[PDB]
Design a protein around this ligand. Structure first.
Ligand SMILES: Cc1cc2nc3c(=O)[nH]c(=O)nc-3n(C[C@H](O)[C@H](O)[C@H](O)COP(=O)(O)OP(=O)(O)OC[C@H]3O[C@@H](n4cnc5c(N)ncnc54)[C@H](O)[C@@H]3O)c2cc1C
Length: 401
């Protein structure tokens, strides 16, 4: 057996499925291989089961990359609105959760269903339980530029689109195959790291484990200056939540994070209003009215915060408390693994890839789309949008040959 398909796609995920659909729709033959048992396994998990498919405010600045000028082209070619429009026209209902985030009303199944439907509608063939391996480059054959082993059959193609994703969720089928193919052809890869992931506590902060389950709004600021205002969640392992997941993109191993527990109010102003309006009251009572009761109690049960009458508090101790709550210098021991991480930072170096095409500069006929590229977006549907955009730029480019 020796099959052929002008276009082969490795990975039946967000980027793979969408690209396969665009190609069939533009009238090109394409086959998709996937080591998994079902298509779009991560799409089904995204957005807590409803799929945060994009965000109303998308710009290149919502993406992390060694190469800042990369993302702009594909994002402007196929926009968040081009997809929002495809979704609505496709009969899918969605709503805005917060911060421009858009989710499906009827679950992530809608997105996966729409993708699989477009592919069936235009001719794309999807083969599951097919793990790709042994990719070889062919040089003389004008019709065959690549050969590869899928199970026991050898496939041949003119264009090979790599949409294998990143490393998070290994139990879901995640593979480094995309990087392995790149490295085999001498294509540079930026060292991958788990991102949009929780932080783990060092020994000195382990006592905060007692706060597990508690949640509050804070502002997290990374050493590079980036800030995010959102919810922070105390865990058994460390700290998590939207604010933490967001800042893990800008945080670097060995680095510290600046956490403001009371971003909202101006503690001193308040502590003073209570110093006049309640000279009798305890510090603990004024504090619990601002922060979670159990956190305030823990600082006390740890002797970190003295509980005295508002009146018996020197203006200097009031200013040390204020700085203490607004400037918590947190140094995580590290990050949780790829089993919790939402994405993977790093990947194929985007400077050797085409900004307009997604095609490899070093190896013609080889394309990289999706998360495998060194393009990581913010939490909030940005990662899926990059998948739609890069998959489209690739398909549109190939249809033009
Ligand atoms: C728990 C969780 C929740 C998430 N929620 C959101 C969200 O709400 N919004 C958002 O924008 N993003 C979200 N993401 C991230 C998002 O899923 C990805 O950024 C996006 O799916 C990347 O698309 P992709 O096609 O590159 O890869 P994937 O969607 O991962 O698909 C690639 C496929 O390639 C296949 N593959 C790998 N190696 C091989 C091989 N050797 N042979 C054949 N096939 C192979 C895999 O089976 C995989 O299914 C979430 C991620 C996780 C883990």
């Amino acid at each position: 057996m020796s099959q052929y398909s002008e276009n082969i796609i490795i990975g039946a995920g967000a980027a793979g499925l969408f690209c396969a659909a665009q190609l069939a729709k533009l009238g090109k033959s394409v086959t998709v291989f996937d080591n998994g048992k079902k298509i779009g396994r991560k799409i089904l998990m995204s957005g807590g089961g409803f799929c945060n498919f994009t965000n109303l405010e998308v710009t290149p600045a919502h993406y992390l990359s060694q190469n800042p000028h990369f993302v702009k082209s594909a994002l402007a070619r196929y926009t968040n609105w081009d997809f929002i429009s495809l979704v609505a026209e496709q009969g899918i209902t969605y709503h805005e959760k917060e911060l421009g985030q858009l989710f499906c009303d009827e679950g992530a199944e809608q997105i996966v269903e729409m993708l699989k439907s477009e592919c069936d509608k235009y001719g794309a063939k999807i083969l599951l339980r097919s793990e790709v391996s042994q990719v070889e480059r062919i040089q003389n054959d004008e019709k065959v530029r690549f050969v590869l082993q899928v199970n026991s059959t050898q496939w041949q193609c003119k264009n090979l689109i790599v949409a294998t994703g990143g490393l998070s969720m290994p139990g879901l089928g995640a593979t480094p195959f995309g990087y392995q193919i790149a490295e085999q052809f001498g294509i540079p890869v930026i060292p991958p790291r788990a991102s949009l992931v929780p932080f783990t506590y060092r020994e000195t902060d382990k006592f905060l484990t007692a706060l597990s389950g508690i949640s509050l709004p804070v502002t997290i600021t990374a050493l590079c200056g980036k800030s995010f205002y959102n919810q922070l969640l105390f865990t058994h392992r460390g700290i998590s939540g939207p604010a933490v997941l967001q800042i893990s993109n800008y945080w670097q191993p060995t680095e510290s994070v600046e956490i403001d527990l009371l971003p909202n109010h101006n503690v001193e102003e308040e502590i003073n209003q209570a110093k006049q309006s309640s000279p009798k009251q305890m510090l603990k009572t004024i504090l619990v009215r601002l922060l979670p009761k159990k956190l305030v109690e823990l600082w006390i049960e740890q002797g970190i915060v003295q509980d005295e009458v508002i009146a018996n508090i020197s203006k200097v101790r009031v200013k040390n408390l204020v700085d203490f709550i607004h400037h918590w210098e947190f140094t995580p021991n590290g990050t949780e693994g790829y089993r919790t991480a939402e994405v993977t930072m790093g990947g194929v170096d985007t400077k050797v890839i085409s900004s307009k095409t997604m095609e490899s500069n070093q190896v013609s006929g080889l394309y990289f789309i999706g998360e495998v590229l060194d393009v990581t977006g913010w939490l909030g549907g940005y990662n899926f949008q990059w998948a739609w955009s890069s998959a489209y730029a690739c398909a549109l480019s190939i249809s033009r040959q």
